[PDB]
Each structure stands twice: as structure tokens, then as C-alpha cells.
RNA sequence: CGCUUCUUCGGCUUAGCUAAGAUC
């Protein structure tokens, strides 16, 4: 060879309040990304996760609640909404999130597994039994 | 193939039938 | 002046251009080269440079089909070509070469191989696209280094006019931005068309009532 | 009107007719020159 | 819960960028068998 | 006049005033579909119907992102139809392919049926828009070639449409004619023929005249003018090339085709390569003089 | 992002120091002995020129980043 | 899951990503259609 | 990359324009065809092979 | 040469069923679904 | 299951051709004299029902006609199309007397209310819109669904409007209040078709997973009619209890409503020169007697089906087999 | 019986249309 790849391709292989203002810029980014493109559910998870990372749990909750208005059948949103509550030790919030998830999508095993597992790890094993009992009431797989 | 090469040169590069002249002989292929 | 004999640098520029821009926008390709037109670049591809154009040696079934078709389809060298599976230039020069063998075999076939038909008389080829390129010289010069540099450039200059121009505002401002922020750091605009999303929770969807009292959860802010 | 005369004339028959009136090298040039790749836009075919 | 997330996250030159690099690997995966009859004519120097 | 203009202005000045006081609510009013907007609207509703068929057809449990790739296969399947390339994707699922093929034929049928309708307008004179005519000529040029490629393929498949009986009948008929006419067949132009430069100069002026009638020139026209000027400057070199071509080549560069838009009927137009036209033009001149 | 050396009463750039590496330098301090001049780069970098060298091709003869600055 | 694998549409005409080449393979969009068409035997009868 | 020249991958939705959801949200500018027209409603005549009589009419 | 490209077996079911090709209207546009 | 009622086979007996695009909609005049048919050639064709002769072709849509309804109480034909238009054709003049404008994208279906002067129309804009037939006013917009609304059907009692969508829900609507008082989520995929049983207080709906029967007015689930695994996009219910469900692949299953037993499985043939990909059925209707089934096809023909006159229970037996 | 480095296996996500939109 002379040039065809090992040059002609290879030669293009390469070529404080300032925090508070950063928060305001990020919400401008996220909220207008939402306005530009709802149903891009990853933006809603990132936005909801980001508010958790800034400690704005109440904001993060509302963002996930607004995500569920766009797609309530997204198992990812319910799980990421659930996981962020139990990351934050918000066990009664997390329980309410799971009860809604299993109420709305009873056939999605991931909610029943994650919920009953959480209630087991947290040593409320008669709570875990009743979750499995309620599951079996749907005659599941 | 040389047999058919010699054969078709008698078919292609002849002068025209309207001139007359004897036919080139061909071979049985 | 257009075309000329092909140079090995040009064939590989053409290969790179074809394997980027795609096999049927030859004008976008030909503007990468000099001297050639789109029609000449297109011809160069299909007539000799394309892979699979069967530049292996000929064989007696090919010659049989070639001599068979040359009787059925006299002079129709573009229709013969698909049926032998060879380029029309290959078909024709093979056929002429086979007649050259057959004609020298009339009599003095050893000297008659040699004293004229050994080579063409050095006239300019009416389509050197059908022929192998000149190898590139022992060192490059301006006519080739320039098009090579322009070729290398264009092959990944994929940013459009809009992106190329206005993204520069980042670099030209951000240093000055940090310098003008350096005034804020060392000397120490209203907006109203929208909600400030950091003032209050936007479009706040409140969490529904559930069987577990949420206020038992105590969270410590990060 | 002798419709589709030019569309339908067989190049092998034409060649044999041209062989009569003119030298065969011209008649072979003429019919071979009718037998060439047509192109429009992205569409290609051999005129046979 | 940190464990679940953390495990979830542990997952020639012919590309302009890593996005085309991943695209080219899909071309390989999905045309691998379907182009073996062509690739031989690519490898043999256009002979 | 005022009797009837009074309610008209009462409405109009009302609408003027109301947007002047209330503002213009008209965001999200239904834009209707009109002359230029039809062809983009067909592509919306096609791609939406295709997408709905994709999502219903795929079974539950598939990553939906595959659907946007299928819309690319649709666009390629159309272009291959448009350009008469045979389309076959080797690994494409047969329900997906069969779904694509139906929509390509619906786009096809609409595309050709609108070519026919617009040409009847152009024939009748019910249209005076140059872009519609220039568009429609493009469609009809493709629809011609799409059928001409069929005709050229069918010839090799169906064989000579003329029987060997008919062909020898017409052949012998011309021999009996030309024999009885004592027609001496036209020789190849001798190496020192007395008339050559006059026939050449006649050929060149037939070529050059086509550029006096034009205000602009481009790279293919420029190269022809260079060849004409070169042939004027050294005709014995030009004649040497011309005669060498008729002896020693039989494979020619591709002929472009175009159509000329006389509103009742299209005429096919061909551009031969400039280096070849000068040889055909001399030969044309030579043949007619000798004949 | 060029350095232009100008003569007194003269508007034209007699000597131009120009390389792709130049940037905005917010502060420049000259030694009282005229042996060295110091320049600060906004990314917490220092590049030096010698007042008698005139190394107009641009250089990074000696550079330091031990300061804890960040702008 | 295998029955509904869709190959990526490697195109001839256009691609906004602007490279879309593997050096190992790229020539593929034209397929592998039947070469050397069966010329009808009637051409032999006509010509001879 | 070019992305503004995108088709409708995302679903269309509606039901919130002028005068939708609340009748007072019609602006007083109204379109030319929104004038009252064809206000006497036509109906099919008696004995038009009406369904129950048709059913009787086996 | 123009004649045909397509099947007869469907036309063989056309022995049992009323196949119709109907490119023209049995009444003019002014014939108004008799009022 | 329980005992099927026996139903005679249906046979193809006529194939009307003359549309140049897919025939997307069919509806039968109340007096059974003629049926209209819209297609992707943007033309509505009126055909004689008994003889198949094309009475009239009405042109005026800008693009594909894909809903067509003849009013039960008015001399009007209503039609809508991919051009967002909805049009009232006065059959006493063969002319478009009224337009209904507000749809933001392609009109998928429309249904004309059996006793009010009300028209409802679906679109890709995920709304059903309710129209005053007289003043063209948009009396309601049913903004419930979240994807294109594929079918709508009207009835005199509550729910006066039932709607199906590509969000895989069926919704029952309060037409007085204009709010969905039930949502039937049971379908896994897009619900493209609906039918109300003409003499039972019961309706059906199709999606590629299952056809489902539903007791009105609450819409409680009765049974699946399972096994027709194709994109079903028409449902027609006979007066005697046959229901039939033509599909995008051109298959055409007939079912006993009462048991759900699929007694016949026709596969349609594309008419000459069409590809095997064009077998699909896009619409179907029963005639008002309920003895001729009219189907509208992706091959641009209209095919008509008739009960086999000579069939009897002992020729085509049904056992019990629960 | 447990921790860490490393490779290694399944997964690893082209923004419409028009007369290639038109022209060289
Ligand atoms: Mg540009």
C-alpha cells in the first residue's frame, strides 16, 4: 500500500454563588430539554437523579411524578423512582411508590421482587410475606 | 480455441458480399 | 485538459473518497481530486479499480464463451461483458490478443509475435481508466502533495458551515468570560419571559396519598 | 409512420446490412457505438 | 441499593469517532456471515 | 356597495380589534394541506403508518430502537425503486420486508399516478409553473428508463424478436437490390484521401455551431471547444486519431441521456463524449458524401 | 492571543511573537533587573520570556504550577 | 429475538454520519444477484 | 451531526388549542368559514326503508 | 411486447365469482341520488 | 367455553376493481341500496350493492380517504382522510356542503351518532373530536388517549362514544360531560378495531394479541376470541351473531359471537399483478340484512362474501368440545 | 475457606421529503 487507509484515514484519526448559578443553569438545561422533548424518558431520570444529588429530594420527587404522567407504563421510571427513595432511606415514601407500581402494573415482576426484597432486607418479614401473598393473588408465573 | 479463432476470422474480417470474390473456407467446429 | 494517465496516488484518494461519500455521488468525489471529472472518476471505478472486476488470469471456459459470444453478438462488447463476467475493455483486448495469437500462427509466429504487435505505438490511450495507474514517483511534488493535503482535510471535515462558524464563540468568549468573571472575583441581567426554575418547584406534581405515613421518613440534606 | 424503427432494429442484423454497403471496420464501429452504457442520474443500463 | 446500581454500571482506522466505531462493530456483527463471499474478493487485492 | 361591505368590515375590523386587544391565540390551529405541502404531508403519514405497523407487528419484548432502522430500510427501498436498483436486504425479517414492499408500492403508485395527472395538466395547459414541469419531466424520465431497462433485459431473455427467416429475407433483398444497382461499397477513408480536411472542417463547424447559440459554457463543453480548436490547428493529427478509432476501438464511454420537454411529447436527447463526437461527425460527413 | 512588540512613536509591529500556543495573559510582571518577565495563564500556568532573547517562535523555557490557584 | 434482528441499513446514496465504512467490509448494498444472464439460444440461430 | 431535520418519531398529541377544554377560550377573531351555514338540517323522508320496517319487509 | 406478464389461475376463480373492472361511472355527477 | 350456535360458511362471490389505491373504508346506505368506499386514491366510489356497478366517483379529498360513513337519518355521507379534512357530502347534490376543520393530523375513523346530529372523528393527533353536524362546532375534544385513535363507534345510550387507540386502551366516554368514565387496559397492543353487537348490549375490540368481548355499559371483560395473531384492523358483527375480523395479512376469520368459536378461516388472494404483500384487508362492513360482507383490500379491490346457501349443520358439524 | 490485579463472555443506541433537490 501507499496511502489508502494507513494515511488517508489515519491522518483523520485525531484532527459560592457560582455554584448557585450552576444549579440554575442545570435546571434551565433539564427543564427545556423536557419542553423540547418529552418521552425522552432518560432525561427525566437524569433530571430526577440530579435533584437527588443536589439534595433537593422534594424537587426530585415532583420530577418523577411528572415523568409518570408522561409514561406511567415505564418500569425504569418506577424502579428509579423507587430506588432513589430507598437510597435516601425514605422507606415510607418507597413503600408508597412500590404499592402504586404493583397496583398499576401487577404483571411486572421487577416491582414485586424489588418490593418484597426491600421489605425483607429491612427485616419486616411479615411485610414481605404479605407482598408475596398479594403477588400470588394474581396467580403469577 | 485456435480452430474457432481461425474460423471466425473468415466470418468477421472479410470484404463485403457485394464485392463477390470466393468465400473463405471455414472449418467445422 | 482533463484526465491524463492515472497515478497510484489518485486511485487511493478515489478509494478513500468512494469509501466515505458512497458509490454514487461522483461529483462530490471528483471535487476532491484535480484533473478528473466525475464521469472519469465513475469510469475509473467500474472499469478497472472496483474490487471483483476479475483481474485474475483468463481460462479456457472464459475464452470459449468469449469466442462463442463474439460470433453470436458481433461487436456488442457491452452485452458480451456481463455474460463472460469481465469488463468490456478486458473482453476486447483479450479478443484482440487471442486474434493476435491466431494471426501470428499463420506463418512466422515467433518473429510475428515481436516485430510490431509487441506493444502499442505510444499514442495516448483513448481511455486510460481501463489501464493500471502509473506508480507514484520516488518523491512527491506540489501537484500531489496539495491534493493529498486537501484530501486528508476534507475526509473528516464533517462540520457544516453553521457548526464551524458559531461554535468558535465558545473559545473566543470563554477565556474572556473567565476574565470578566475575574472582575466579579476581584471588584466585589434581568430575565422575566419565563419562570426562574430555581425560585420554586416548577409544575409541582404532589405525591399521592398512600397507606404509609410519609412523615415518618426523616431525611438529612446533603 | 414506421413506428419504433430505431427502437427495434437489431444490432446484429444492422451490422450485417452495414457490412454490405461499407467497409467492415466502419460497420463494426457503427454498431458497437450503438451498444453503450446509457446513464441518467443514478440509473444505468447497457443499450443492447 | 448502591450495590445494585454499581454492578449495573460495570458494562484498520475506519471511524471518525467512537460513535462510528460502535456503528462499524454493528456492521461487522450483522453482515459478518452475509459478506464472506464478498470479503474474499476484497482481500485478494481486487484480483 | 356599503350595504354589503358593512357586515364584511364589521367582521374584519372585529378580528383586527380582537387580536389587537386579546392577542393572537392562533398557536396550534390546524394548518391545512395545500399545493406545495402535499408531498411532505404524504411522507409524514406514510412514515407514521409504517411506524404503527412496525410497533404492532413486533412481538412484546423487543427493543423498540430497531423501528427507526426499519424506516431507513424503507427510504432505501424507495430510492432503489426510483433508481431501478434491485433492492434485497439479506437478513431483513420477512414480515418487515413484506411490510416495506407494500409501502414502497403505495409510494410508487402515488408517485407515478401523480406524474400522469400532472402531465395531462401540462398537455392541456392547466399549469404554468416551471417547477411543476421540471419536476414532472424528472419523474417521466425515470419512468421511461425504468421501462427501457425492462425492454433491454427482455431482449436478451426473449432473444431476437426477428426470426432468422425474416432476417435472411431482408438481407438477401438488399443484396439483390444493391447488386442490381451496381453499388460499389464505401471504402475505408484512404490514408491520403483528397477530401478529408474539407469533410473534417464541415464536421467541426456542425459541432462548434451548437455553442454560438449559448451564453454559458461548462467543463464538458469547454473540452469540446478545445478539441475543435486543436483539430483546426493540426488537422492531420485529428484525422490520424479519427481513422485510428474506426480501426481499433469498439468500447466507448457511457452515453448520458436527457429528455426535451415539448409539452405534448418528450424527445430523448443524448450527449456523446466530446472526443467521440468529432469522430462520429467526420464519419457522418464521410458516409453522406460517399453515399 | 498574539504578542506584538512595538517601537515608541511607531504604530507598526516590528517583531511579532506568534504561535498557536498563545492565550490571554491576565497579568504580566517584569523583574526590576530586566532579566526576566513573568506571565500568568488562566488555567493556572506560567510561561516565561527573557527580555534579551526575543524568542518570537514562542517557548515554555521554564514553567511552574505549584500555586494552589484556580483562576 | 433472533428472528427480529434488523440489519443496519448500509446505504448507497446518503448517510449523515459521514463515514459509514468498515475497512473489513463495506461492499454489500448491491447484493449478490445472478451474474451472466442466460442469453437466449435464438441468437445463435439468427447469427449463423 | 444534523438533527433539526428530523421526522415524527415522537407521537403527535392535541386537545388544548383555542376553545378546547373551556368555551370562553375562543378568541373573538374567527375564521371566514365559521359563519353560520346550512342551518336547516335535512332529514331522510318517511318510508326510506327504515330499519324496523325493513326488518318486517324480510 | 406489451401483451401480458401475469397469472390466469386467479382468473380461474373468476369462473366462480363476479370479477369486475369498472373504470367508468354508471351515472353522471349531476344525477343526484334521486331526491 | 359453551356450545356454539352454528353458522353457515361464507364464500367469495364478487370482486369489484377500480380503485387505484388501497380501499380504506366501506359503509352501507341505510336502505341497503348502495355502499360507499374511500381509498388511497383520494376518491370515494359509490357502488350499487346488488349489481356492483360503480354509480359515482366523488373526488375532493386532498389525500387518502380512510373514513366513510353514510348517515342513518340524513341524506349525508361523511368522510375524513389523511389530509385532516372531514367533509359532509350532500347526496342530494353530490357536493361537499360542510367541512369540520380542527384535526391536527390524519383522520383515522369517524362515526355518526345514531340519534343526535353529532359526528365523532378520530385522528393521529390522539384526540377524538365531537362535531355538531349542523353548525360544524367542536362540541367536545376527547383528549384522553396518548397515541393515535384508531377507531370510534357511537350508540344512543351511555357510553355514547367508545374509542380505541394505539396506546392499547379502549375508553368509554360520557358524551354529555365529555370525560372518559372507563378505561379498558386489557389489550397488550394497539386496538385498531371496534364493533358493537347490533342486538346485544355488548361490544368487541381487536388487537394483534386478542379480540376481546365486553359487556356494556360498564365494559366488563367477557372473553377473548383468541388465535387470530395478525394486525386485525376490522371487526364486523352480524345481526344473527357472526363476527368477522379481517387482518393486515389478508386472512379473514369468522367467529360465533356467543361461544367465540372460529368456524371459518378465509385467506384472501391478491388480484392479478399485485404482490403477495398486498393481501391485506383494511375495512369491512355487513350489509343491512347481514348476509353480504363487503371487505376493502390492500390490493385495491373490493371483495364481497355471501353465506353458502346449501350448507347445513350436518354438512358442517359442530360437536361440543368444552 | 476470603480480598485484589488482569483478560474474557452476552449485552454495547445513522434525526424526513423534493427534479441523485438543483449546479460545476
Ligand atoms: Mg455545503
Amino acid at each position: 500500500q501507499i496511502t489508502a487507509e494507513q494515511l488517508l484515514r489515519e491522518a483523520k484519526e485525531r484532527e459560592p454563588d457560582e455554584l448557585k448559578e450552576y444549579q440554575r443553569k442545570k435546571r434551565k438545561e433539564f427543564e427545556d430539554g423536557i419542553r423540547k422533548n418529552r418521552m425522552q424518558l432518560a432525561n427525566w431520570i437524569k433530571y430526577g437523579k440530579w435533584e437527588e444529588s443536589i439534595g433537593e429530594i422534594q424537587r426530585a420527587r415532583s420530577v418523577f411524578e411528572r415523568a409518570l404522567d408522561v409514561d406511567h407504563r415505564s418500569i425504569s421510571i418506577w424502579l428509579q423512582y423507587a430506588e432513589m427513595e430507598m437510597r435516601c432511606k425514605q422507606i415510607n415514601h418507597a413503600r408508597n411508590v412500590f404499592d402504586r407500581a404493583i397496583t398499576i402494573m401487577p404483571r411486572a415482576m421487577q416491582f414485586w421482587l424489588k418490593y418484597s426484597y426491600m421489605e425483607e432486607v429491612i427485616e419486616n418479614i411479615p411485610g414481605a410475606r404479605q407482598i408475596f401473598e398479594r403477588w400470588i393473588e394474581w396467580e403469577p408465573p | 480455441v485456435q480452430l474457432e479463432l481461425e474460423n471466425l476470422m473468415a466470418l468477421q474480417n472479410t470484404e463485403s458480399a457485394l464485392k463477390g470474390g470466393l468465400n473463405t473456407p471455414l472449418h467445422e467446429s | 485538459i482533463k484526465g491524463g494517465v492515472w497515478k497510484n496516488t489518485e486511485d487511493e484518494i478515489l478509494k478513500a473518497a468512494i469509501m466515505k461519500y458512497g458509490k454514487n455521488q461522483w461529483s462530490r468525489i471528483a471535487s476532491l481530486l484535480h484533473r478528473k471529472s466525475a464521469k472519469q472518476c465513475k469510469a475509473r471505478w467500474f472499469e478497472w479499480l472496483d474490487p471483483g472486476i476479475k483481474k485474475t488470469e483468463w481460462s479456457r471456459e472464459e475464452d470459449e464463451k468469449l469466442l462463442h459470444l463474439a460470433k453470436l453478438m458481433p461487436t456488442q462488447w457491452r452485452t458480451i461483458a456481463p455474460i463472460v463476467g469481465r469488463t468490456s475493455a478486458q473482453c476486447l483486448e483479450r479478443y484482440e490478443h487471442l486474434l493476435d495469437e491466431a494471426q501470428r500462427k499463420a506463418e512466422g509466429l515467433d518473429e510475428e509475435a515481436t516485430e510490431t504487435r509487441k506493444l502499442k505505438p505510444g499514442e495516448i490511450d483513448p481511455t486510460p481508466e481501463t489501464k493500471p495507474a502509473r506508480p507514484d514517483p520516488i518523491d512527491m511534488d506540489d501537484d500531489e502533495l496539495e491534493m493529498l493535503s486537501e484530501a486528508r482535510a476534507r475526509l473528516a471535515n464533517t462540520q457544516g458551515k453553521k457548526a464551524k462558524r458559531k461554535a468558535r464563540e465558545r473559545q473566543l468568549s470563554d477565556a474572556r468570560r473567565l476574565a470578566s468573571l475575574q472582575k466579579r472575583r476581584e471588584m466585589r441581567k434581568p430575565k422575566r419571559n419565563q419562570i426562574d426554575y430555581s425560585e420554586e418547584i416548577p409544575f409541582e406534581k404532589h405525591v399521592p396519598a398512600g397507606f404509609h405515613n410519609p412523615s415518618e421518613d426523616r431525611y438529612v440534606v446533603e | 409512420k414506421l413506428e419504433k424503427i430505431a427502437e427495434k432494429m437489431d444490432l446484429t442484423l444492422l451490422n450485417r446490412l452495414l457490412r454490405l454497403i461499407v467497409d467492415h471496420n466502419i460497420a463494426d464501429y457503427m454498431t458497437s457505438k450503438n451498444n453503450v452504457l446509457i446513464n441518467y442520474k443514478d440509473m444505468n443500463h447497457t443499450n443492447s | 441499593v448502591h450495590g445494585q446500581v454499581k454492578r449495573r454500571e460495570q458494562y484498520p482506522i475506519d471511524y471518525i469517532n467512537e460513535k462510528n466505531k460502535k456503528f462499524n462493530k454493528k456492521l461487522d456483527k450483522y453482515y459478518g456471515k452475509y459478506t464472506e463471499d464478498i470479503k474474499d474478493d476484497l482481500e485478494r487485492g481486487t484480483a | 356597495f356599503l350595504r354589503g361591505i358593512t357586515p364584511l368590515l364589521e367582521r374584519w375590523l372585529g378580528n383586527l380589534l380582537s387580536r389587537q386587544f386579546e392577542g393572537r391565540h392562533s398557536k396550534g390551529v390546524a394548518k391545512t394541506v395545500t399545493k406545495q405541502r402535499v408531498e411532505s404531508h404524504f411522507d409524514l403519514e406514510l412514515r407514521a403508518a409504517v411506524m404503527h405497523d412496525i410497533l404492532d407487528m413486533m412481538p412484546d419484548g423487543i427493543k423498540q430502537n430497531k423501528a427507526r432502522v426499519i424506516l431507513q430500510h424503507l427510504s432505501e427501498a424507495w430510492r432503489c425503486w426510483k433508481a431501478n436498483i434491485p433492492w434485497k436486504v439479506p437478513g431483513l425479517p420477512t414480515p418487515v420486508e413484506n411490510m416495506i414492499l407494500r409501502y414502497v408500492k403505495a409510494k410508487a403508485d402515488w408517485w407515478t399516478n401523480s406524474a400522469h395527472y400532472n402531465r395531462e395538466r401540462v398537455r392541456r395547459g392547466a399549469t404554468v409553473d416551471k417547477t411543476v414541469c421540471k419536476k414532472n419531466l424528472g419523474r417521466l424520465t425515470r419512468l421511461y428508463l425504468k421501462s427501457e431497462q425492462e425492454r433491454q433485459h427482455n431482449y436478451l431473455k426473449d432473444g431476437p424478436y426477428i426470426s432468422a427467416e425474416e432476417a435472411v429475407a431482408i438481407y438477401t433483398t438488399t443484396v439483390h437490390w444493391l447488386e442490381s444497382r451496381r453499388f460499389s461499397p464505401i471504402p475505408f477513408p484512404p490514408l491520403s484521401y483528397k477530401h478529408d480536411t474539407k469533410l473534417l472542417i464541415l464536421a467541426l463547424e456542425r459541432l462548434k455551431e451548437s455553442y454560438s447559440v449559448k451564453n454559458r459554457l461548462n467543463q464538458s463543453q469547454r473540452e469540446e471547444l478545445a478539441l475543435i480548436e486543436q483539430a483546426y490547428d493540426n488537422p492531420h493529427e485529428a484525422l490520424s486519431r479519427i481513422k485510428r478509432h474506426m480501426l481499433t476501438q469498439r468500447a466507448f464511454k457511457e452515453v448520458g441521456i436527457e429528455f426535451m420537454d415539448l409539452y405534448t411529447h418528450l424527445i430523448p436527447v443524448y450527449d456523446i463524449e466530446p472526443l467521440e463526437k468529432v469522430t462520429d461527425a467526420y464519419l457522418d460527413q464521410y458516409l453522406w458524401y460517399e453515399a | 492571543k498574539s504578542v506584538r512588540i512595538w517601537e515608541w512613536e511607531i504604530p507598526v509591529d516590528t517583531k511579532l511573537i506568534q504561535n498557536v500556543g498563545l492565550h490571554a495573559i491576565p497579568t504580566m510582571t517584569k523583574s526590576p533587573n530586566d532579566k526576566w518577565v513573568v506571565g500568568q495563564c488562566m488555567d493556572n500556568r506560567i510561561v516565561l520570556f527573557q527580555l534579551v532573547d526575543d524568542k518570537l517562535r514562542f517557548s515554555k523555557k521554564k514553567a511552574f504550577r505549584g500555586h494552589n490557584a484556580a483562576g | 429475538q433472533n428472528d427480529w434482528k434488523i440489519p443496519p441499513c448500509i446505504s448507497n446514496w446518503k448517510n449523515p454520519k459521514g463515514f459509514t465504512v468498515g475497512l473489513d467490509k463495506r461492499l454489500a448494498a448491491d447484493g449478490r444477484g445472478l451474474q451472466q444472464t442466460h442469453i437466449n439460444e435464438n441468437f445463435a440461430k439468427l447469427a449463423d | 451531526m444534523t438533527t433539526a431535520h428530523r421526522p415524527t418519531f415522537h407521537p403527535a398529541r392535541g386537545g388544548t388549542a383555542r376553545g378546547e377544554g373551556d368555551l370562553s377560550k375562543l378568541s373573538n377573531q374567527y375564521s371566514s368559514k365559521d359563519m353560520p351555514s346550512h342551518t336547516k338540517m335535512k332529514y331522510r323522508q318517511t318510508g326510506q326503508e327504515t330499519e324496523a320496517d325493513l326488518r318486517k319487509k324480510d | 411486447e406489451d401483451k401480458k406478464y401475469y397469472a390466469t389461475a386467479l382468473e380461474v376463480y373468476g369462473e366462480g365469482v363476479e370479477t369486475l373492472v369498472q373504470e367508468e361511472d354508471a351515472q353522471p355527477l349531476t344525477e343526484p341520488i334521486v331526491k | 367455553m359453551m356450545k356454539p350456535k352454528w353458522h353457515a360458511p361464507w364464500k367469495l362471490y364478487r370482486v369489484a376493481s377500480g380503485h387505484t389505491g388501497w380501499v380504506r373504508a366501506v359503509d352501507v346506505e341505510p336502505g341497503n341500496q348502495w355502499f360507499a368506499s374511500g381509498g388511497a386514491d383520494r376518491i370515494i366510489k359509490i357502488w350499487d350493492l346488488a349489481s356492483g356497478q360503480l354509480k359515482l366517483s366523488l373526488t375532493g379529498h386532498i389525500s387518502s380517504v380512510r373514513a366513510v360513513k353514510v348517515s342513518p337519518r340524513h341524506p349525508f355521507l361523511f368522510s375524513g382522510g389523511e389530509d385532516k379534512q372531514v367533509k359532509c357530502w350532500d347526496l342530494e347534490y353530490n357536493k361537499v356542503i360542510r367541512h369540520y376543520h380542527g384535526h391536527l393530523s390524519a383522520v383515522q375513523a369517524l362515526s355518526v351518532h345514531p340519534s343526535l346530529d353529532v359526528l365523532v372523528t378520530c385522528a393521529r393527533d390522539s384526540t377524538a373530536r365531537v362535531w355538531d353536524m349542523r353548525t360544524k362546532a367542536q362540541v367536545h375534544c376527547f383528549a384522553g388517549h396518548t397515541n393515535t385513535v384508531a377507531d370510534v363507534v357511537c350508540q344512543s345510550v351511555d357510553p355514547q362514544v367508545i374509542t380505541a387507540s394505539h396506546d392499547a386502551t379502549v375508553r368509554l366516554w360520557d358524551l354529555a360531560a365529555g370525560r372518559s368514565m372507563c378505561t379498558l387496559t386489557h389489550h397488550k397492543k394497539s386496538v385498531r378495531a371496534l364493533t358493537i353487537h347490533p342486538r346485544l348490549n355488548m361490544f368487541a375490540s381487536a388487537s394483534p394479541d386478542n379480540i376481546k368481548q365486553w359487556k356494556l355499559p360498564k365494559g366488563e371483560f367477557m372473553q377473548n376470541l383468541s388465535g387470530h395473531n395478525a394486525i386485525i384492523n376490522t371487526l364486523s358483527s352480524n345481526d344473527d351473531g357472526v363476527v368477522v375480523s379481517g387482518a393486515d395479512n389478508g386472512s379473514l376469520c369468522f367467529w360465533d359471537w356467543r361461544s367465540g368459536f372460529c368456524f371459518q378461516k378465509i385467506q384472501t388472494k391478491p388480484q392479478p399483478g399485485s404482490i403477495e404483500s398486498e393481501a391485506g384487508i383494511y375495512a369491512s362492513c355487513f350489509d343491512k340484512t347481514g348476509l353480504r360482507l363487503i371487505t376493502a383490500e390492500a390490493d385495491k379491490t373490493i371483495k364481497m362474501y355471501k353465506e353458502d346457501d346449501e350448507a347445513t349443520e350436518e354438512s358442517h358439524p359442530i360437536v361440543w368440545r368444552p
Side-chain angles (χ1 to χ4, degrees), chain F residues 43 47 63 68 75 78 82 135 139 142 218:
Chain F
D43 203 79
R47 290 176 76 90
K63 297 185 73 193
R68 298 180 67 249
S75 73
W78 173 239
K82 239 184 174 179
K135 273 182 172 184
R139 298 201 184 174
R142 291 188 173 283
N218 317 93

Side-chain angles (χ1 to χ4, degrees), chain F residues 20-62:
Chain F
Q20 198 60 62
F21 281 101
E22 302 181 24
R24 176 165 46 246
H25 204 318
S26 314
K27 295 170 68 194
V29 77
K31 271 300 193 180
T32 203
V33 56
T34 57
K35 289 184 170 72
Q36 74 285 1
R37 193 180 294 129
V38 177
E39 301 191 318
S40 50
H41 188 65
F42 183 85
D43 203 79
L44 267 174
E45 298 301 337
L46 191 97
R47 290 176 76 90
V50 169
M51 180 57 61
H52 287 311
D53 291 349
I54 290 160
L55 295 172
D56 295 353
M57 184 174 80
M58 292 196 299
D60 302 301
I62 292 196

Side-chain angles (χ1 to χ4, degrees), chain K residues 124 131 148 239 246 293 320:
Chain K
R124 289 211 302 105
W131 303 103
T148 81
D239 189 60
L293 168 78
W320 74 305

